[PDB]
Amino acid sequence: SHMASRLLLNNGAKMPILGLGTWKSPPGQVTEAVKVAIDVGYRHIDCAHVYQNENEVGVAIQEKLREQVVKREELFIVSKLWCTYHEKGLVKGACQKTLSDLKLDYLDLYLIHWPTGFKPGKEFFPLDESGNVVPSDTNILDTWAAMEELVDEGLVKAIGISNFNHLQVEMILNKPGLKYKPAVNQIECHPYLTQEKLIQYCQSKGIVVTAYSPLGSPDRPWAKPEDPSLLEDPRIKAIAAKHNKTTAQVLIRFPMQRNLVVIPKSVTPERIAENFKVFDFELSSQDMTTLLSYNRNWRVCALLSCTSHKDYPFHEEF
Ligand SMILES: NC(=O)c1ccc[n+]([C@@H]2O[C@H](COP(=O)([O-])OP(=O)(O)OC[C@H]3O[C@@H](n4cnc5c(N)ncnc54)[C@H](OP(=O)(O)O)[C@@H]3O)[C@@H](O)[C@H]2O)c1
Ligand SMILES: CSc1ccc(/C=C2/C(C)=C(CC(=O)O)c3cc(F)ccc32)cc1
């Protein structure tokens, strides 16, 4: 289908363009979900400390390594530094905690989960008595230096960012004494949020973009009835039907043809397999442009708690 399975990052490593997402995958189901994914061909898993299921994901990876279904070098494991760990002195420990839970001795990619730093502590979202999230005074350039140390200590092969707008990406690229550029910016992207500008900017700098919530995150906990629904969009279903594929398969193939990495989440064995079977057809340039035309600047993940945080990413146009 004129589609290679991996693309080149600016650290010299290759990254599988299809990965399994794990946000919201319940701890009692994610182990089998990851086993099934690897069994059917996935080599890239997207994780995060904040998803609270890294231990269970790790059980799956470890078993598949033990069974010799796959070698570690063939796996591409991604995790993310949570906001309460931006303080320089906490970054390594957060990384090591994720490594211990995932049962790995290194990550292929470690991302700053959000540009917004929070006060350190047990709570993922520390609040003042009025309900506001309490920020940290750490700035993202120092956090980036801490991330660079992880590469130099061998804990991760690549470092990157997530939910950074183009000015924030630019701030890193212009950092005095920058040692390693971000390899990846992982951002929300689907036909209702097409991200033409941010994607063009990142790619122009050699930063690879990963598209999250490619199916529109129907299981997002804050979903409402008025919300659009990609999987129910007759226009998208029509394109699927024309190709004898499912609507989800079209939604996953879409970012692949824009040179994006994409990470659909499922804990359903049947859908896990379906979501991987997207290398056997090609959307036309017309299909692509039609899908792009559906942009609404509609976000699943707007982090509405933190609009007042100085580093909140989504006030900027991109
Ligand atoms: N960096 C960030 O801040 C950030 C933010 C959001 C997401 N992400 C990453 O991106 C991943 C994917 O995003 P997401 O979890 O928000 O949502 P998503 O992948 O767009 O959609 C997941 C939902 O779609 C369902 N689904 C999966 N395959 C399907 C299919 N073939 N047909 C019908 N329904 C299907 C899943 O149900 P079942 O699981 O029940 O099958 C689940 O409810 C996340 O898991 C996470 O790893 C990162
Ligand atoms: C402090 S009240 C609040 C504020 C923000 C959010 C938003 C969240 C979003 C967008 C995500 C997905 C992601 O960032 O990957 C998330 C994952 C988690 F484990 C926990 C919370 C959140 C949820 C609740």
Swiss-Prot record:
Cys-301 may regulate the kinetic and inhibition properties of the enzyme, but does not participate in catalysis. Tolrestat inhibits retinal reduction. Transmembrane segments: none annotated. It comes from the Eukaryota. GO terms for biological process: C21-steroid hormone biosynthetic process; carbohydrate metabolic process; cellular hyperosmotic salinity response; daunorubicin metabolic process; doxorubicin metabolic process; epithelial cell maturation; fructose biosynthetic process; metanephric collecting duct development. The modification N6-acetyllysine is found at residues 97, 224, 265. It catalyses: an alditol + NADP(+) = an aldose + NADPH + H(+); all-trans-retinol + NADP(+) = all-trans-retinal + NADPH + H(+); 9-cis-retinol + NADP(+) = 9-cis-retinal + NADPH + H(+); 13-cis-retinol + NADP(+) = 13-cis-retinal + NADPH + H(+). InterPro entries: AKR (IPR020471), Aldo/ket_reductase_CS (IPR018170), NADP_OxRdtase_dom (IPR023210), NADP_OxRdtase_dom_sf (IPR036812). The modification Phosphoserine is found at residue 5. GO terms for cellular component: cytosol; extracellular exosome; extracellular space; mitochondrion; nucleoplasm. Its EC number is 1.1.1.21, 1.1.1.300, 1.1.1.372, 1.1.1.54. The modification N-acetylalanine is found at residue 4. Its main location: cytoplasm. Monomer. Belongs to the aldo/keto reductase family. This is Aldo-keto reductase family 1 member B1. The gene is AKR1B1.
